[PDB]
Design a protein around this ligand. Structure first.
Ligand SMILES: [Mg+2]
Ligand SMILES: [Mg+2]
Ligand SMILES: [Mg+2]
Ligand SMILES: [Mg+2]
Ligand SMILES: [Mg+2]
Ligand SMILES: [Mg+2]
Ligand SMILES: [Mg+2]
Ligand SMILES: [Mg+2]
Ligand SMILES: [Mg+2]
Ligand SMILES: [Mg+2]
Ligand SMILES: [Mg+2]
Ligand SMILES: [Mg+2]
Ligand SMILES: [Mg+2]
Ligand SMILES: [Mg+2]
Ligand SMILES: [Mg+2]
Ligand SMILES: [Mg+2]
Ligand SMILES: [Mg+2]
Ligand SMILES: [Mg+2]
Ligand SMILES: [Mg+2]
Ligand SMILES: [Mg+2]
Ligand SMILES: [Mg+2]
Ligand SMILES: [Mg+2]
Ligand SMILES: [Mg+2]
Ligand SMILES: [Mg+2]
Ligand SMILES: [Mg+2]
Ligand SMILES: [Mg+2]
Ligand SMILES: [Mg+2]
Ligand SMILES: [Mg+2]
Ligand SMILES: [Mg+2]
Ligand SMILES: [Mg+2]
Ligand SMILES: [Mg+2]
Ligand SMILES: [Mg+2]
Ligand SMILES: [Mg+2]
Ligand SMILES: [Mg+2]
Ligand SMILES: [Mg+2]
Ligand SMILES: [Mg+2]
Ligand SMILES: [Mg+2]
Ligand SMILES: [Mg+2]
Ligand SMILES: [Mg+2]
Ligand SMILES: [Mg+2]
Ligand SMILES: [Mg+2]
Ligand SMILES: [Mg+2]
Ligand SMILES: [Mg+2]
Ligand SMILES: [Mg+2]
Ligand SMILES: [Mg+2]
Ligand SMILES: [Mg+2]
Ligand SMILES: [Mg+2]
Ligand SMILES: [Mg+2]
Ligand SMILES: [Mg+2]
Ligand SMILES: [Mg+2]
Lengths: 48, 172, 170, 119, 203, 116
RNA sequence: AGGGUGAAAAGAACCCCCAUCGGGGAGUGAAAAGAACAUGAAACCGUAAGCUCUCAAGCAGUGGGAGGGGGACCAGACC
RNA sequence: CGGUAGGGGAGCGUUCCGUGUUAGGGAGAAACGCGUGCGUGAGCCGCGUUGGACGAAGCGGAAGCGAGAAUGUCGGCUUGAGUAACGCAAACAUUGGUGAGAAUCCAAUGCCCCGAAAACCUAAGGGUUCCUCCGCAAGGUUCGUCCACGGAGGGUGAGU
């Protein structure tokens, strides 16, 4: 099956923005993790 | 003249081997963030792009320190964009004599770091005044000091610009 | 010179201070003082009172269209042939003359009623694109049309008084 | 003498494109599409400069109808108009509609004249 | 959280300044009630006499509008629904505009006493279709009127309202109740004028 | 589906996964602490504990069962020496799992499994 | 198939980010024109500011124009 | 005074030549971007916090002279999509080491696969791919400190 038409500019921008939103949730995990290693109290975690 | 001269350091990376979409995914997250937060985030992110972007931002911060004399504490990432670079094409063979095209996309990245504190004098002083008080205060000073006062980020942040050109408080 | 001073100071010294552009000389005029209200009147003017016009309006026929005219106002019409800028014309086809005390209703015309107007301009209208098109018959024609137009100003509505008025009198 | 077409193309195109400002999507981008879209625009425009003259008469008549129906139980647009004519008044429909909204008392007066004379 | 920091303070203050100055020089609104041809102020404005009057925002505002009550007992369904449609639409005001809501609200009470001529009580057929095949459903008028009688009059008026955005938004202005009582007493409903002869049936 | 299927697959077939686990535990007992993927760790717990609990009893039977799991004899003997000393009072639970930064190559979550 | 930095390589000393590439200053230059370097259209990719879309059916325009914003001098106009 | 096939009339523009080594032009030409300007239209006239050296009007002449369609054609860039795939189901694992950076580079210890080969050698072919040092733009279907890749410097010895 092929694409009978070509995908319009704006719709494509919406789909790719959806794929860019996962970056937002990743940035939240990363931030929380940083604030956890920034106290040096975690015994479950280790860095070198 | 303009705020862009006072607050801003601009840094361009050229020809980073990230493709523009991937790299955009990371750059969207750091837009508008304190330079500190952006540091730690970019250290712990999963993505590959994060490393080159990191080197870049660290650099631009160093530039604002050593060149234009800014405090690193007060840096935010004000404007960041990724634009397409030079695409290198290569041809590979497919099944049954057909070929195909691989593109090896590059990008330019532009990070513009902007001091918050610079202008803060005029900033908070003009916040201090009610809207009438300010127009009474601007009734004294010559065209010169008017232009010098109001040439902060002030007129934009509170969206007065077209109002003050209507009050005949200015010349263009 | 305070522009050159504050700009050379924001040039030479990076990170500008408020004390340099605005010296500690100016307290600002007190919010209740006359020297406050002259400025706040200059920069924030109060709406001025409306100009006086007569309370009257007429309905007049020009170029076979009917306009409502109130005096002091200018309207657009068909070109009037042989009219020059600064001409005093009189419009004699007057169907209706309203006043807030009275309304005169012609049968058809208000007799002796005259509308004095002055022709202030002779124009050409906003260009209309007349466009003729037929699909697949490979025929399109692009043609502009500018209509000539006369812009006139109503001055006064006169000579009605004798004609019989009606009223809503409750 | 070889002649490149040069700018003669892109001027034409550009002058077309200026027309098509604020068309959603690819009607504001691609030249080839923009062309068509220009023609259709000009075309509808021409059409509706003609529809217009029909439509406001539609409107005015409707408003007049409403404005009169308030007065008598039995009174219409039609009856009214017929009476305007057998009384020899020239006021056209734009004017009666505008006087209907903007000076309603006036229209009441007119009606009172028409009645008095038809009485 | 509403920040009371000098910044947001400043901004709100300024915006009320802009609004003040924009209000002072703008042309006043003069509502349409004995509204004479022109105020000395409009006279300086645009040309509203030689163009068709179109309603501005101050006019149609929802809070103004009339309310009406139709006692539907011994009324004939269709003939009443036409009246209702006229009023809801606004076709009976001099100010009528196709593109705007100038209309009223109409409250229909006693929606189970509405009357219909001839055999329709048992014949007329309200169909609605699931969207699956074999998904057709049918009621006689009477089954409906015993089950949920309001839907009958809603379904008859919605037919005569315009279709499309304005149509639907209009349809919300029709308030229907099966009992003889409506909880709208606060809105001060006027009674509905009916100029039709045949609308009232007598047994 | 799986309801109540409790085993760790490690994305390997049965044979390989067995051999993998044998290997990883001889490594853990030889070095005392190691770095792996969180999955491999969580899976490896059970078999670590099997060996320890095995050596707490010490019988020729038990020792033969350990020899037939672990790869290197030397490590087994060392176990049957050390364990009664080091773990005598600990009733179960001989491993720590301390997780870390993910791997650069694949972003595989890592972890540090320690012999506690 | 791959032409045009500048008049002249004067092709960027020195400091900073710094494993290199790449960059920001300083310096050269009429101009940075900074070596992927002269004018640099379109597609296409974005960034910012103004208005606006989550009960909606549509070759996307057009005539009517609610509400909101902008640069004016014929402030009743234009965008 | 509707108009297809089609015929007739009147025009606009492009590059070049004559006038002309013209008027004008580093006090900013062509071009590019703009217009509340003027045309029935093709277009013209005016303007530029672009551009950096050419070149109008008039009155004439000549054509490689006007594009949206040729499954035209050559370059550029999209869509599909951050999707399918990453080339066997011999299988990797851990500890050190080097390094700015290691799932992938080196070493060690296990484990696993081939063994009438997935071993060693020779004909043909290829042509420097061999070795050492340096490198990590491109190539390598990921990575890369590595390489059959790039840079230098070496290397093939016969009476049988
Ligand atoms: Mg083949
Ligand atoms: Mg292919
Ligand atoms: Mg044809
Ligand atoms: Mg040529
Ligand atoms: Mg050609
Ligand atoms: Mg538009
Ligand atoms: Mg897998
Ligand atoms: Mg087996
Ligand atoms: Mg196997
Ligand atoms: Mg067990
Ligand atoms: Mg440099
Ligand atoms: Mg290195
Ligand atoms: Mg460098
Ligand atoms: Mg410099
Ligand atoms: Mg210099
Ligand atoms: Mg260029
Ligand atoms: Mg709905
Ligand atoms: Mg909505
Ligand atoms: Mg819709
Ligand atoms: Mg003809
Ligand atoms: Mg023909
Ligand atoms: Mg010419
Ligand atoms: Mg020319
Ligand atoms: Mg030429
Ligand atoms: Mg000369
Ligand atoms: Mg010029
Ligand atoms: Mg030329
Ligand atoms: Mg021209
Ligand atoms: Mg010419
Ligand atoms: Mg020159
Ligand atoms: Mg000439
Ligand atoms: Mg040819
Ligand atoms: Mg083409
Ligand atoms: Mg092609
Ligand atoms: Mg793509
Ligand atoms: Mg798909
Ligand atoms: Mg899938
Ligand atoms: Mg897949
Ligand atoms: Mg395949
Ligand atoms: Mg493979
Ligand atoms: Mg075997
Ligand atoms: Mg081999
Ligand atoms: Mg060999
Ligand atoms: Mg050989
Ligand atoms: Mg070679
Ligand atoms: Mg080798
Ligand atoms: Mg490489
Ligand atoms: Mg690679
Ligand atoms: Mg290295
Ligand atoms: Mg080599």
């Amino acid at each position: 099956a092929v694409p009978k038409k070509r995908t319009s500019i704006y719709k494509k921008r919406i789909r790719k923005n959806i794929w860019k939103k996962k970056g937002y949730w990743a940035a939240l995990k990363a931030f929380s993790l940083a604030k956890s290693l920034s106290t040096g109290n975690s015994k479950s975690f280790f860095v070198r | 003249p303009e705020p862009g001269k006072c607050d801003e350091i601009t840094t361009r990376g050229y020809s980073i081997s990230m493709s523009v979409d991937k790299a955009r995914r990371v750059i969207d997250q750091i837009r508008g963030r304190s330079y500190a937060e952006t540091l730690m985030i970019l250290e712990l992110m999963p993505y590959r792009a994060c490393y080159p972007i990191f080197k870049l931002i660290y650099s631009a911060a160093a530039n604002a320190s050593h060149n234009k004399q800014f405090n690193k504490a007060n840096l935010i990432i004000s404007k960041a964009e990724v634009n397409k670079g030079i695409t290198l094409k290569k041809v590979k063979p497919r099944a049954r004599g057909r070929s195909y095209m691989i593109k090896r996309p590059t990008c330019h990245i532009t990070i513009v770091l902007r001091d918050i504190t610079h202008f803060d004098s005029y900033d908070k002083f003009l916040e201090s005044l009610t809207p009438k008080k300010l127009i009474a205060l601007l009734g004294l000073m010559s065209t010169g000091r008017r232009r010098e006062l109001l040439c902060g980020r002030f007129r934009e942040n509170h969206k007065i610009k077209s109002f003050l050109y209507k009050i005949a408080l200015f010349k263009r | 010179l305070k522009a050159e001073f504050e700009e050379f100071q924001r040039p030479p010294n990076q990170k500008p201070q408020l004390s340099d552009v605005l010296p500690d000389d100016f307290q600002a005029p007190e919010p209740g003082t006359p020297e406050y209200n002259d400025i706040i009147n200059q920069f924030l003017p109060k709406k001025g009172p409306p100009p006086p016009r007569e309370e009257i309006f007429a309905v007049v026929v020009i170029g076979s269209r009917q306009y409502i005219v109130i005096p002091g106002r200018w309207i657009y019409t068909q070109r009037l042939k042989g009219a020059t800028v600064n001409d005093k014309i009189v419009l004699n086809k007057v169907l209706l003359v309203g006043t807030k005390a009275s309304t005169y209703i012609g049968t058809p015309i208000v007799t002796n009623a005259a509308v004095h107007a002055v022709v202030e301009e002779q124009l050409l209208d906003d260009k209309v694109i007349v466009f003729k098109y037929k699909k697949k018959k490979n025929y399109r024609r692009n043609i502009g049309h500018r209509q000539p137009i006369t812009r006139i100003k109503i001055t006064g509505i006169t000579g009605y008084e004798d004609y019989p008025a009606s009223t809503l009198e409750a | 003498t070889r002649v490149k077409r040069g700018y003669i193309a892109r001027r034409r195109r550009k002058k077309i494109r200026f027309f098509a400002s604020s068309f959603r999507g690819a009607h504001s981008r691609l030249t080839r599409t923009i062309a068509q879209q220009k023609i259709r625009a000009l075309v509808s425009a021409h059409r509706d400069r003609d529809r217009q003259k029909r439509d406001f008469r539609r409107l005015w008549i409707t408003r007049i109808n409403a404005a009169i129906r308030e007065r008598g139980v039995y009174y219409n647009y039609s009856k009214f108009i017929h009476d305007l004519y057998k009384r020899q008044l020239l006021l056209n429909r734009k004017i009666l509609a505008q006087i209907a909204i903007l000076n309603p008392n006036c229209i009441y007066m007119i009606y009172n004249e028409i009645i008095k004379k038809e009485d | 959280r509403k920040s009371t920091s000098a910044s947001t303070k400043c901004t709100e203050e300024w915006r009320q300044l802009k609004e003040a100055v924009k209000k002072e020089f703008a042309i006043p609104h003069v509502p349409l009630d004995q509204r004479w041809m022109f105020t000395l102020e409009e006279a300086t404005g645009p040309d509203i006499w030689n163009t068709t009057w179109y309603p501005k925002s101050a006019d149609h505002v929802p809070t103004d509008k009339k309310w009406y009550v139709v006692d539907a007992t011994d009324l004939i369904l269709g003939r009443m629904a036409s009246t209702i449609a006229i009023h809801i639409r606004g076709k009976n005001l001099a100010s009528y505009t196709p593109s705007v809501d100038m209309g009223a609200f109409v409250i229909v009470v006693n929606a189970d006493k509405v009357a219909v001529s001839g055999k329709k009580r048992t014949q007329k057929l309200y169909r609605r279709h699931s969207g699956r095949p074999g998904g057709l459903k049918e009621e006689t008028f009477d089954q409906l009127q015993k089950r949920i009688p309001e839907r009958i009059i809603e379904h008859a008026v919605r037919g005569m309202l315009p279709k499309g955005r304005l149509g639907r938004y209009l349809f919300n202005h029709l308030k229907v109740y099966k009992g003889a009582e409506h909880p709208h007493q606060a809105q001060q409903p006027i009674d509905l004028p009916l100029r039709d002869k045949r609308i009232r049936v007598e047994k | 589906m799986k309801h109540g299927r409790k085993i760790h697959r490690l994305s390997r077939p049965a044979d390989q996964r067995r051999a993998l686990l044998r290997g990883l535990t001889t490594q853990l007992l030889k070095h005392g602490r190691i770095k792996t993927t969180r999955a491999k760790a969580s899976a490896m717990r059970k078999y670590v504990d099997k060996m320890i609990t095995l050596a707490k009893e010490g019988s020729l039977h038990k020792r033969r069962q350990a020899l037939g799991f672990i790869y290197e004899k030397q490590i087994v003997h060392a176990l049957f020496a050390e364990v009664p000393e080091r773990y005598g009072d600990r009733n179960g639970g001989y491993t720590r799992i301390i997780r870390t930064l993910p791997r650069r190559g694949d972003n595989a979550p890592m972890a540090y499994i320690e012999l506690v």
